[PDB]
């Protein structure tokens, strides 16, 4: 090979510490693989109260802090996977999702799973690409 | 960085319009992240009739139109995820899958989920790489 | 384009032959997309006996052989998805996972699905990046 690709563990105390043997995200070259985020408060380590709407907000806030630690924001996200405890929460989740993904909407997969870590109602993973990016048509 | 990577929202009217805040696919540099495709008719916005076999055909047709809009075909796909409402549909789905993936078979994950958007019986996401590609051994 | 990216089907007889129309992994440029691995013995084609712990070990061994065939080991893995038949197996699976992922922990998503191929209790997919890699901070 002509290059040694730079791999970095992304880590920020403003998102919850890992609850298992994983990194919050891994950057390799320009691609950031972000772990599935759940609605855990970064301080208490427990899910925020209030159900799917509050959990979704917290999960996206956690994702935002991980992106920021990699020098990115939500405009760098190119793909997400939205894992739901209840498919009937899709409309509620989409409204919250739109508060964070305001442009350049990522590709997405969404589905209801049988269960999530910690009894969460939502988990969101993502792939982001470090800028600069040029958005054409 | 020495380059600004080109990010493009892939969009074609020959696949159904987005049912939420997502793009049909996002191309960034050479990598295309394709959203989970379900068996929705691009005109009516509703699932085709007939169950998993017809839905799988339509989902793959939708994926094919998105690939074509990115200057690709199914030979550019390197990974898929096949999400099933019923794991017992795997054999039926595989026969249809083979009508579209004729060579250079993608890596794949497959599993049964609890529920899919719109009560779909199958959702297929994919990663593709824009050519030219040289397939070695 | 200024380059034709090299795409290679990764194949090793030390991991089970494909049970459907997929490749064990696909390498394209430097990125390896590894199919969901289940606890199948490479010789018998059947799941190993003993439940989730033995299946997880076998699935990771299978993944290790695929990585080795691509000139990689577990340190090249940057993202995994751990699909469980039972979320309550997470702690057991994590202990086994740690026997293979000893450093540079991948990003991860984990959740319980409704069912897996062959009645498996665990399926693990992964993305790896071919070296050389330089791990910074």
Curated annotation (Swiss-Prot), chains A, B, C:
Modification Phosphothreonine, positions: 75
Entry GO CC: cytoplasm; cytosol; extracellular exosome; mitochondrial matrix; mitochondrion; nucleus; peroxisome
GO terms for biological process, alphabetical: L-threonine catabolic process to glycine; lipid metabolic process; mRNA catabolic process; mRNA destabilization; negative regulation of translation
Swiss-Prot/TrEMBL catalytic activity: 2-iminobutanoate + H2O = 2-oxobutanoate + NH4(+); 2-iminopropanoate + H2O = pyruvate + NH4(+)
UniProt keyword annotations, A-Z: Acetylation, Cytoplasm, Hydrolase, Lipid metabolism, Mitochondrion, Nucleus, Peroxisome, Phosphoprotein, RNA-binding
Domain of life per record: Eukaryota
Chain positions found as Phosphoserine: 137
Catalytic class of the enzyme: hydrolase
Tissue: Expressed predominantly in liver and kidney. Lower levels in lung and brain.
Keyword RNA-binding belongs to the record: yes
Subcellular location: Cytoplasm; Nucleus; Peroxisome; Mitochondrion
Family assignment from sequence similarity: Belongs to the RutC family.
NCBIfam families: Rid family detoxifying hydrolase (TIGR00004)
Quaternary state and interactors: Homotrimer. Interacts with YTHDF2.
Function: Catalyzes the hydrolytic deamination of enamine/imine intermediates that form during the course of normal metabolism. May facilitate the release of ammonia from these potentially toxic reactive metabolites, reducing their impact on cellular components. It may act on enamine/imine intermediates formed by several types of pyridoxal-5'-phosphate-dependent dehydratases including L-threonine dehydratase. Also promotes endoribonucleolytic cleavage of some transcripts by promoting recruitment of the ribonuclease P/MRP complex. Acts by bridging YTHDF2 and the ribonuclease P/MRP complex. RIDA/HRSP12 binds to N6-methyladenosine (m6A)-containing mRNAs containing a 5'-GGUUC-3' motif: cooperative binding of RIDA/HRSP12 and YTHDF2 to such transcripts lead to recruitment of the ribonuclease P/MRP complex and subsequent endoribonucleolytic cleavage.
Record's protein name: 2-iminobutanoate/2-iminopropanoate deaminase
């Amino acid at each position: 090979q002509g290059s040694s690709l730079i791999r970095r563990v992304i880590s920020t105390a403003k998102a919850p510490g890992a609850i298992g043997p994983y990194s919050q995200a891994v950057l390799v070259d320009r691609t950031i693989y972000i772990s599935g985020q759940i609605g855990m408060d970064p301080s208490s380590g427990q899910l925020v109260s209030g159900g799917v709407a509050e959990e979704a907000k917290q999960a996206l806030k956690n994702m935002g802090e991980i992106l920021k630690a990699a020098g990115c924001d939500f405009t760098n996200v190119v793909k997400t996977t939205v894992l739901l405890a209840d498919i009937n929460d899709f409309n509620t989740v989409n409204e919250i999702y739109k508060q964070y993904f305001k442009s350049n909407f990522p590709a997405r997969a969404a589905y209801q799973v049988a269960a999530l870590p910690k009894g969460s109602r939502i988990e969101i993973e993502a792939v982001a690409i470090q800028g600069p990016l040029t958005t054409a048509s």
